[PDB]
């Protein structure tokens, strides 16, 4: 019948609305009301009370769960035309279930049934009888000829407008009332309002009023906090602006909204605070886009046309054909008009023609925004632990309420009013803010992080960051700042009597300087700027060349030079080549890694291999330069056929000034830090030894000989020792290899060992991985996760975006300056991004890792202390209320209100705290149920109940109460009320002061004054009340004057209970707080 085919949906059934008569909360209750009215025409009023309660609960139940709603309100049907609602069962990894409405409208004489789920359109395909999301031509089966033969949309495009929709983000911000209406129905708020209604029924007016006002204030604050974020998500959408669109074989200006797939557009220089409308593929022309917003890189790429590729044979691969794609949201710096004529007339503006591919939420940035908004997963997805913890307290509640009921029946009290006290106790045991504690902790931590420019895309990853066991770094862009300092040319001396002989500048032969000036990818814009790789800019400034607006680069003091044609640079077969021209003749230069350049030129120098390894061993990074004279548009293998050596480029990459200290702190903080990079092993080992990852000597695993025989050779950085190894036959020796050298593994040795039995034993002792392909990083992270070690990878992001999402927590360290961000913030205030990794840091410093780890640790430990404090306060309050209600006494209004205020004063201050700068070796354990929490809670509760029972025995000894007939609980001054109230108010503060978090994680209690002074003031008030130091206070609060002997017992008992609780909590914390670190985070070498 009816179905939905999409990766989001799992199952679906149609619905139809049911009349109000047949609803489950209207008809079945009228017979019960009639029976109650007949029986009525004391003990019967509780029956009407519970009947109204059950009715309102049945009426509120459909809003809590969606399946209950679908079963109550609607009845399932299997006819697609008649149904006016539909239910969607989501895939367990995408959002949650929901009910969505089916809409109908007639177009072109035929009705089209469509709805919208998670801002993802659907339609009704008559032949398949199944709702299906609209499918774009690019994804399923692209053909490169189809994009060329297209001539844009023509005619009346109403069906396309219905199928694809408007090309804009659609996030509606609801009004405050609409959001508060939903927040009110929530189970927590309903339970809290019911708890307040009970206190109203028990003749507590001011207490209930204050509590209700506080609840309403908290809900209003939460709604404002949600609305501000919903408004923040709106600014990511681009502002509509005019572009030219090809329709009806003529250029007409349409806004950004009225865009559809397979529509021709003309892109020009992007304006201020604007971006590219939607995902496009170039059809003709060129552009220099700036991917800083989507990719998070500074170097602006160079995009080329697709017209040159043949149309019939080739397919649109989105691989080698990635230079033609323009992602949405990026800015275009310079665009060039089409050179030759085509079937379509040239655009009125000098912009480049391009084809739209994806519109709306289905582009990359749109998909990311949708995933962030709807399919986001909240913290503590399981949520079973909080409910189990609440059931524990409810068991204790029932144990106390049974005794309350038995004693109330024994002392002659009325049962009709005693059931109300039983319900009060049971409902006062349960804390409402218990399950929603981790969310508030994570939100506070996210705010404190965003104060440090460390913005967070996915919040639930924060508790993962608290206890991380292995953190993986990257060499370039992360541990090395990209400000290269040119050192000097080398290897140009044919004699070369000295290996390390360097020519600074203005001394090499003209060939070397011509080559280093010709082969580069820089370009000057029409406005006038220099854009490119900063290493090339630094090199070009050091040698003294100058690039003009035209590709010609001259004025270097040696002549005039121009670039005729250039070749792209790729990771595979890595090198850059270009063909230039000099006033005498024409030549061709090439610049690439030395290992690949050596196998190209004919005349091999004698000191090549020696000098390359010598300069690579100590920090420096080398590049080779070669040229060939070319006599007078051709392929790439002819220009690079044979070459002539011209020298080396020696770049000394300096470390970030903040790397050594952060790595030292991470090493001494019970974390293991390993390096994963793509550079050659010598430079990687040198950087790892200078930073502090490897201490002693190091070994390098690599191929033995040029033959692909898969034989790995252990070899030191120098030629001092060489150990032969065989992956098929031999095996790793622990004492001979792992105990002494802390080896480093090359990607080739990791590939050849794929399938060995001791791979998982090898991956425990290595700290440095070099020459790993972007695919093997995912394998390494997956293996580290499989062994049971949580991972934290911090890299630049643009090179390996898929690897960051694999680790438990990933960070992308962008490039920026503190003064730049300060000026930007000042400009934004006067006026009033990576988006690819989970966590982003706008600043280039490395301390973001330490910052996020510390914040996660603090969030975890704050959650723990809030659990303990809430549970203990609830139990204490419950048992104090029980001890009171056993007899006829009860609190008044002023006493309970003052108790509430004096506890809220401490609740305010206890959230504040400043984390210690240095991390600690003790990692906090996650989970509610463990020896520490349960032991501490139960034993502190034992001490508190011992104190309470002793003082109650003493008070009953002082004044005896006799069983009276038909007692009614009423407030009158008596010794029992005084004693129990002072004990309650002192013991809650005692728990607040004992269960505060220790120094090692965040801070000591004494350091912060906001809590110290509050606790001292409340304890001073309580001690002046207990000792009768100010008779005006006792008289004003209705406290009976106590005997001289009883005050001593009260004061000493409280002062001893505090010490007992402190001692027990300190013992449990000293013995069961920190979990043991793993076997990999140890420090030892021989």
- Residues comprising the binding site? 474-476, 569, 621, 679, 796-800
Sign of torsion over alpha carbons 179, 180, 181, 185 = positive
Annotated binding site for Mg(2+): 474, 476, 796
Annotated binding site for ATP: 474-476, 569, 621, 679, 796-800
* Collapsed DSSP state (helix, strand, coil) of residue 854: helix
DSSP string, 748-790: HHHHHTTT-TTHHHHTTT--EEES--TTHHHHHHHHHHHTT--
| Number of residues that make up the chain | 1086
Helix residue ranges, H only, 522-651: 534-543, 594-598, 608-617, 636-639
Asked if 825 contacts 453 with a C-beta cutoff of 8 angstroms, the reply is no
- Beta strand 130-132 with 4-5 is parallel
Token pair for residue 130? Answer: 């199944």
Q: Which of 783, 780, 774, 833 is nearest to 802 (CA)?
A: 774
Q: Which helix (H) or strand (E) holds 873?
A: helix 848-886
* Collapsed DSSP state (helix, strand, coil) of residue 480: strand
Rounded Cα–Cα distance for residues 189 and 43 (Å): 30
Rounded Cα–Cα distance for residues 625 and 597 (Å): 8
Asked if 43 contacts 416 with a C-beta cutoff of 8 angstroms, the reply is yes
Asked if 935 contacts 1072 with a C-beta cutoff of 8 angstroms, the reply is yes
Helix residue ranges, H only, 41-175: 45-64, 66-72, 137-140, 144-149, 158-164
Asked if 127 contacts 133 with a C-beta cutoff of 8 angstroms, the reply is no
Rounded Cα–Cα distance for residues 627 and 806 (Å): 43
Q: Which of 1056, 1044, 1054, 1068 is nearest to 1019 (CA)?
A: 1054
Q: Which residues contact 691 (CB under 8 A, 6 or more apart)?
A: 479, 655, 659, 660, 663
* Collapsed DSSP state (helix, strand, coil) of residue 890: coil
Rounded Cα–Cα distance for residues 749 and 770 (Å): 10
SS (H, E, C) 552-580: CEECCCCCEEEEEEECCCCCCCCEEEEEE
DSSP assignment, residue 41? -
Pick left, alpha or beta for residue 109 (phi over 0 → left; psi -120 to 50 → alpha; otherwise beta): left
Query: Any catalytic annotation for residue 321?
Result: no
Q: Which of 101, 70, 79 is nearest to 2 (CA)?
A: 79
The residue from 263, 279, 421, 474 that is catalytic is 474
Q: Which helix (H) or strand (E) holds 372?
A: helix 364-373
Sign of torsion over alpha carbons 678, 679, 680, 684 = negative
Active-site positions read: 474
């Amino acid at each position: 019948k009816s179905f939905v085919s999409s990766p989001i949906v799992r199952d679906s059934t149609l619905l139809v609305p049911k009349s109000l008569i047949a609803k489950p909360y209207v008809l079945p209750f009228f017979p019960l009301y009639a029976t109650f009215a007949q029986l009525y025409f004391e003990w019967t009023f509780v029956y009407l009370g519970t009947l109204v309660s059950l009715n309102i609960l049945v009426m509120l139940m459909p809003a809590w769960n969606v399946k209950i709603k679908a079963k109550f309100n609607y009845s399932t049907t299997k006819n697609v035309n008649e149904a006016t609602h539909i239910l969607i069962y989501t895939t367990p990894n995408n959002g949650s279930d929901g009910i969505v409405e089916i809409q109908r409208v007639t177009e072109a004489g035929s009705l089209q049934t469509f709805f919208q789920f998670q801002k993802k359109r659907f339609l009704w395909h008559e032949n398949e009888q199944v709702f299906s999301s609209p499918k774009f031509l690019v994804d399923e089966s692209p053909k490169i000829g189809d994009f060329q033969k297209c001539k844009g949309h023509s005619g009346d495009l109403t069906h396309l407008k219905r199928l694809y929709g408007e090309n804009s983000f659609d996030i509606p911000i609801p009004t405050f009332m609409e959001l508060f209406k939903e927040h009110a129905v929530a189970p927590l708020f309903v339970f809290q309002v019911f708890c307040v209604a009970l206190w109203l029924l028990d003749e507590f007016w001011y207490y209930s009023l204050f509590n209700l006002f506080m609840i309403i204030s908290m809900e209003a604050a939460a709604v404002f906090q949600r609305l501000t974020a919903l408004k923040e998500f709106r600014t990511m959408g681009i502002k509509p602006y005019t572009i030219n669109v090809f329709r009806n074989k003529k250029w007409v200006a349409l806004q950004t909204n009225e865009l559809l797939p397979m529509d021709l557009v003309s892109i020009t220089r992007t304006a201020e605070e604007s971006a590219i409308p939607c995902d496009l593929i170039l059809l003709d022309g060129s552009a220099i886009v700036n991917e800083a917003m989507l990719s998070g890189e500074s170097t602006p790429l160079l995009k080329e046309s697709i017209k040159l590729r043949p149309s019939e044979d080739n397919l649109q691969l989105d691989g080698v054909d990635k230079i033609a794609v323009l992602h949405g949201g990026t800015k275009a710096l310079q665009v060039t008009p089409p050179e030759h004529k085509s079937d379509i007339p040239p655009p009125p503006d000098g912009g480049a023609l391009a084809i739209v591919t994806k519109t709306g939420f289905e582009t990359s940035q749109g998909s990311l925004v949708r995933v962030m908004i709807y399919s986001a997963e909240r913290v503590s997805v399981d949520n079973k632990e909080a409910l189990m913890f609440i059931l524990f307290l409810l068991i204790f509640a029932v144990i106390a309420s049974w005794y309350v009921w038995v004693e109330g029946t024994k002392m002659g009290r009325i049962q009709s009013k005693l059931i109300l006290d039983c319900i009060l106790i049971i409902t006062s045991v349960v804390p409402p803010e218990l399950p929603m504690e981790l969310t508030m902790a994570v939100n506070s931590s996210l705010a404190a992080l965003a104060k440090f420019y460390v913005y967070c895309t996915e919040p639930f990853r924060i508790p993962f960051a608290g206890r991380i066991d292995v953190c993986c770094f990257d060499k370039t862009g992360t541990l090395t700042g990209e400000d290269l300092v040119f050192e000097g040319l080398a290897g140009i001396s044919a004699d070369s009597e000295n290996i390390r002989h360097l020519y600074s500048a203005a001394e090499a032969p003209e060939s070397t300087i011509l080559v280093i000036g010709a082969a580069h990818a820089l370009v000057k814009l029409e406005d006038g700027d220099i854009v490119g790789d900063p290493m090339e800019k630094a090199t070009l400034k050091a040698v003294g060349w100058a690039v003009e607006r035209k590709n010609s680069n001259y004025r270097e003091g040696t002549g005039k030079l121009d670039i005729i044609r250039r070749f792209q640079f790729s990771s595979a077969l890595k090198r850059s080549a270009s063909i230039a021209s000099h006033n005498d003749a024409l030549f061709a230069a090439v610049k690439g890694a030395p290992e690949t350049i050596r196998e190209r030129l004919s005349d091999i120098p004698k000191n090549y291999d020696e000098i390359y390894k010598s300069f690579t061993r100590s920090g420096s990074r080398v590049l080779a330069l070669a040229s060939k004279s070319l006599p007078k548009d051709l392929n790439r293998d002819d220009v690079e056929s044979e070459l002539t050596f011209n020298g080396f480029l020696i770049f000394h990459c300096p470390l970030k000034d903040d790397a050594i200290e952060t790595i030292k702190m991470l090493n001494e903080s019970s974390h293991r830090s390993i390096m994963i990079t793509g550079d050659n092993p010598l430079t990687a080992v040198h950087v790892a030894k200078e930073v502090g990852i490897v201490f002693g000597e190091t070994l390098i695993l690599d191929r033995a000989g040029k033959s692909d025989d898969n034989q790995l050779l252990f070899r030191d950085v120098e030629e001092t020792v060489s150990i032969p190894f065989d992956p098929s036959k031999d095996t790793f020796d622990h004492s001979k290899l792992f105990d002494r050298y802390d080896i480093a593994v090359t990607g080739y040795a990791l590939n050849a060992l794929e399938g060995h039995s001791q791979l998982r034993d090898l991956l425990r002792h290595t700290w440095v991985y070099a020459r790993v392909s972007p695919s093997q990083k995912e394998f390494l992270l997956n293996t580290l996760k499989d062994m049971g070690y949580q991972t934290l990878m911090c890299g630049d992001g643009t090179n390996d975006v898929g690897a960051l999402k694999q680790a438990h927590v990933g960070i992308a360290l962008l490039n920026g300056t503190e003064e730049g961000l300060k000026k930007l913030g000042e400009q934004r205030r006067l006026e009033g991004a990576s988006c690819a990794a989970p966590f982003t840091s706008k600043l280039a410093n490395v301390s973001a890792v330490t910052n996020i780890i510390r914040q996660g640790r603090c969030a975890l430990v704050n959650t723990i202390q809030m659990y303990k404090i809430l549970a203990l306060n609830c139990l204490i309050s419950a048992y104090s209320l029980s001890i009171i209600y056993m007899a006829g006494v009860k609190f008044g209004d002023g006493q309970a209100t003052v108790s509430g205020l004096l506890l809220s004063v401490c609740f305010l201050s206890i959230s504040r705290g400043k984390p210690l700068e240095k991390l600690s070796k003790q990692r906090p354990q996650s989970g509610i149920f463990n020896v520490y929490i349960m032991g501490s809670i139960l034993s502190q509760f034992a001490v508190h109940i011992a104190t309470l029972v002793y003082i109650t025995t003493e008070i009953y000894k002082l004044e005896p109460r006799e069983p009276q007939v038909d007692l009614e609980k009423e407030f009158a001054p008596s010794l029992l009320n005084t004693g129990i109230f002072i004990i309650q108010l002192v013991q809650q503060v005692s728990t607040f002061a004992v269960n505060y978090q220790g120094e090692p994680f965040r801070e000591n209690i004494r350091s912060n004054k906001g809590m110290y002074y509050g606790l001292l003031g409340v304890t001073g008030l309580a001690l002046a009340s207990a000792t009768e130091f100010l008779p005006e206070l006792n008289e004003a609060m209705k406290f009976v004057p106590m005997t001289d002997d009883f005050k001593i017992k009260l004061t000493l008992t409280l002062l001893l209970d505090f010490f007992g609780s402190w001692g027990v909590e300190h013992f449990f914390k000293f013995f069961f707080m920190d979990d043991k670190p793993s076997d990999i985070s140890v420090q030892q070498v021989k």
